[PDB]
Symmetry: D2
Subunit: 380 residues, 4 copies
Amino acid sequence: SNKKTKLIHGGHTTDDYTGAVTTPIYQTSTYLQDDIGDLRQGYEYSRTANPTRSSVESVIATLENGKHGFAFSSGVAAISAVVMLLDKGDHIILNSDVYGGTARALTKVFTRFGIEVDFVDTTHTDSIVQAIRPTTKMLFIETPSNPLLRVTDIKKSAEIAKEHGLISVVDNTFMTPYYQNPLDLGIDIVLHSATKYLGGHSDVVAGLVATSDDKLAERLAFISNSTGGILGPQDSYLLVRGIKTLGLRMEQINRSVIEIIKMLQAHPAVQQVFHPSIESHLNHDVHMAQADGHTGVIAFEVKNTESAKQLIKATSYYTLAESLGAVESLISVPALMTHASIPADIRAKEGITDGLVRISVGIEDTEDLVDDLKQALDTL
Amino acid sequence: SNKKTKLIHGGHTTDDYTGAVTTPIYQTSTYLQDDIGDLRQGYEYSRTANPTRSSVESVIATLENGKHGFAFSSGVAAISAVVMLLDKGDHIILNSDVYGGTARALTKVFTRFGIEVDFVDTTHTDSIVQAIRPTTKMLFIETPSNPLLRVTDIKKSAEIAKEHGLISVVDNTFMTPYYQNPLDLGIDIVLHSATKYLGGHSDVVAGLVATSDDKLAERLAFISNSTGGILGPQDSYLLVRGIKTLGLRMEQINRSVIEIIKMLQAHPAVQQVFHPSIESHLNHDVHMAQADGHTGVIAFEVKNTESAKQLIKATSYYTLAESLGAVESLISVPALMTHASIPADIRAKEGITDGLVRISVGIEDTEDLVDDLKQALDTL
Amino acid sequence: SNKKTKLIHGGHTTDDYTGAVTTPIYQTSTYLQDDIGDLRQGYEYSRTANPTRSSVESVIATLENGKHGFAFSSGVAAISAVVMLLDKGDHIILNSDVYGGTARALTKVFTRFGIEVDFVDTTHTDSIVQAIRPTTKMLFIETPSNPLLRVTDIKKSAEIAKEHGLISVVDNTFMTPYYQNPLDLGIDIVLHSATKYLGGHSDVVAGLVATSDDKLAERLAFISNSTGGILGPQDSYLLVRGIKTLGLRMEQINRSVIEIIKMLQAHPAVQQVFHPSIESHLNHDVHMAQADGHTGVIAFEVKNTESAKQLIKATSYYTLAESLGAVESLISVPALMTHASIPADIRAKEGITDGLVRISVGIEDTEDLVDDLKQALDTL
Amino acid sequence: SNKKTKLIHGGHTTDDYTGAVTTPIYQTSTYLQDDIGDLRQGYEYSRTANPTRSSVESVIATLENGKHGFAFSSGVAAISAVVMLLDKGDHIILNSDVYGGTARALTKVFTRFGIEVDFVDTTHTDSIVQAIRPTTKMLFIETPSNPLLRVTDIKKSAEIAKEHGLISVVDNTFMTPYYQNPLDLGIDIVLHSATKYLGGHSDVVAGLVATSDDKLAERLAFISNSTGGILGPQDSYLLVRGIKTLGLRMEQINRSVIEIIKMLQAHPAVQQVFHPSIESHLNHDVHMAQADGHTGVIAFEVKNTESAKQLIKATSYYTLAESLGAVESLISVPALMTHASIPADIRAKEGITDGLVRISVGIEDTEDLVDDLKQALDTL
Ligand code: NA
Ligand code: NA
Ligand code: NA
Ligand code: NA
Ligand code: NA
Ligand code: NA
Ligand code: NA
Ligand code: NA
């Protein structure tokens, strides 16, 4: 059973009752009990459990080789639920360039509840060892990160977390379960913004979490039931549907990524290119060892803000919009759209130059995507 | 513009673009920008704002005579967002019989983040004054409460909160905006489990929050955007649709409540009856002064567990299930279904006797509901 | 079991499998077979049967006291399926002012297939007897009709159809199953544009058909399966949901209809008023004998086109739009919007004057609807 | 702009108003008019036109290089609408093995309306010329057909229809617009059961029609508006969403088809194999000239009914169910499931042997699909 087959037949996404080959949408809040406390099929109140949500939870658990899945109303709701495993006075280590919304949730919400946050350059895992405090309880890493696609060694991070008694978490959004499986590498919890590649069609906001740890799963179920950031049934259905084509979409994206990077590296109007497939990229070898494919997110430098805006206007098949992982190729300028509150000198210092462009490669024809971006770069 | 008209024409629930007389369902995660940072209609990412969610938020703000509305993935997500207005070391006063999920969220989740919780018998508002600590920052009250329907003076609670610098919150689920408007009485924040009467059809899990305070609204928007417990667009649509009939449903429920209470008070197999419309009920006068109708939740005592189970089996039109506010009349036994973890002696002490039955009156014919419950009581 | 109870508990609208108190939405096209030809629950292909569609079909059959229900993609699809019971050379009698879309389907589509159409003033049922040809096979009547609300004797029409071997059909859209049940009066087939009152929320286009005749049901199932105008599962779900409040909505509409008619009859800027509740209305006695309530459609004359347009602009709570049976009160001018292709002299002859206004009364507050229309009429 | 790009960016599938990158779902029946007859965006009643339906209609018109698209409640509703272009006494030529539902609609429904049907072996187009009567008005062909995948020359059929004044129609379901474009070859009307490959996820029943002929489009719009077999907005949305991955899905299906056919041709338990890619298949050259890929439907003979049933039970990744074009590979036995009413001698004569198996290849991993079917065949 290869990956493309598991996407179709893994998890429980049919109706045992009627035989319907797709998961029914249980647009319902509560369930008849035949006797007090006797549930016909284990359902009693949809916040606690809903059969359509249970379907998408079984899918993500199967795809990540876990035991328990959890579906949340957004990626950041999944992150907040996982952070809530901790208590006031606990410390969490994160990669220093973690997603802006993650950094914001931790530094502007959870620090008010006494969670301490240290961000660390995890591209060298001994940086994690140094940052571990007596109060550290969690290690949270994305790999590759946004927008410069820094790679962190997942297996080494798992071993460090195990040795020091930490809950290890990987935000696996950019790679998806099709290419990278952190639970197989010893990580405790894997999570996703399903808003991106998993849904795949820019039409669901959702978060997904998987684990093989029965005790962490019990704690996550309790947090989900008590703080209530649950995914609804229609969105759960669209997630299950979108995941069916995950393998085909990711493979098309990867073919285009390879050709687009060739073009960018050869083009005179492009300076540095950031992507883990590039052999001079930091921890390229580490990425190849923990993943069998690539994210569709690429960043590259043109000269300045004026060039970046002109590039966007000159393209036919790159769409200016937020998010990533659509069927459409998306284009953005981090310095103006996601890092604009950071002072310009600090942006430059971090590599977020005025001309840094981020593209999220979609499923359009590969030659069209290469040719379109090249001709637009030619106008610079 | 009387209440039934406001339910139809209040808020923005049409499409300015096409003229569609219902709110379009924006099953979408992101939005084209014509230039970087220029949003066509103010939308850029659905977690931050979605037009269908904006519609239901405008409805609840209008119905509660507020300025800002917020839609969450569940009632307890709305509560958790409001609690997150506080910091570690802050103290919150709640009515002592607040909803089990609320008590659980505060005592098992937020206390781990250093929020201190005191529950207080708010039926005498001077009990609030005594409980105020130097660190108290929030007063959170339901009225009437579950399952014994205790009434708390909203206007007096608002004045106490204003005098002592507290954020006042009313959980207005049981009364709905059709009958009780806490913001008009000086409360800062009103919230609802829209899962119940507002949706009205047992098919959406959702929370709604309204306020007239610009600064609290800004803080709530930030929390919602950062912890991500947002309501999806399909559920937002069904909420808007369900609210259209809120007035008709509540008025039918109220006619049936009055007749059912007459029957229960006269029946020999029934002991005490709990409902704010009963003139000997504590704070009946207070309820009449802050509300112009009644909740459909009634509790009453039969002899024991055996009688309660027999009552349920003997009814034709009362459905054994969790939640309340359905179009169906629902029946439950709190001692077995919502308070079973409390020791029996403590249950008895609280009034949660083995024979305490809770009904949530639906919109069936009034004579059918009275006759059905009477004939079932006759079998005891 | 009174009507309001039957709307909640009649038909099968829960899930036997999970106990979900609402019908699951089976967004599915096909179903697993455990062995060739063995269907787990009788489903094999959604065009032939879908469980969500089966739910709404069971509702309409129960509400009309029939045995078989059928759900179509629109009211006119339900009509076309029923017309297709006939063969080339067959003749159908219809009331002379039948719905414009019905007249159009018969005279511009089915006459090309050799169905012969005679329209007849059925307010005198002996007009039907005279029109019966040797080739007549069907009698199709609406009562009350649009826009002048002509009433036809259903029971007498059923007896005539039985005596002459005709299939009798009543379009029961305007009255709904809450007020008028043609199958109980001997009619073979009853149908509805569920787009109007049954859905009730201006958000579904659908047709519903019910019958107690096993052989007609078999023929209708065959036509539905072969020409494929089936209602989808999401629309079927919204129909089931909307029907729950049918009784409450119709009763509110009826209270407002009575008061609005009082106002219109007293107002000097209004001439003739058309509604079956008016005691001088033709066949008022017949309507009272076959129905226990009223449609919310009222027509009345103001002076001219200029007055009609001014009336519409002056109202606050009457919405200019097509269709009827919304929660919003709707207003229209038939001479301009539904009868504009008829020459003006023929319109005048038929009673469709330039100043004829049609209102579809919604569920807004009764005093608001009366006061708003009166003050707008006062500006004339 | 290659095919994979056109699937993403062709047609209008964003919101001009908000910029939403997906088509909003207009769950609505009617639209505000600012003045009588003035439509804000051309919408007035959803049966006539709905913006979500308009989106999917623009997609199919673009994908088929037509000008007008039409969305129906099912494939057979699209066929029935196209047949209704004809009058009583008109004659239609169809390929002799056309889809069972098509044959049934014509011979059991439309013949009652005086449409005359001749079915003809169109694999030789001079068979069409011979069958043309003075009353012939339409030529309706599928290619390739079901279940033996007979190929008909589209371009020659178009020329014959033009010379003899016939409306030419191609049912393009099996090939999809990704591989075969009949309008480009001179055909007047192309239609699809979107229930199959276009939706692609076994969760929508729908039909789609496209044409470049303004006058035929006007007649189809009239028929659609009058007989009302329209696709709803939720199903229209899911169609637009499913079509995005059409190219990726079809290409994966085609890789698997090629390898599966190699295996079947080499296996001793398999006799004849039917698929247009096989070079000895009748009109293989014709197929290559009018299409640039293949259908995923393959039929092959095993020995008998017992072997066919054993094959099905022995597979892990082939699902026994009706329909085709799912993401799952589907398996069926025509003699038992689609041709069982035909007498056995006539079935054998037609090639529909007891051991004829039909598979619809899905998007599972190619090696898994080959290996699974081979090991199951090995058990025979
Ligand atoms: Na599965
Ligand atoms: Na582990
Ligand atoms: Na409004
Ligand atoms: Na205030
Ligand atoms: Na029922
Ligand atoms: Na009868
Ligand atoms: Na486009
Ligand atoms: Na042409």
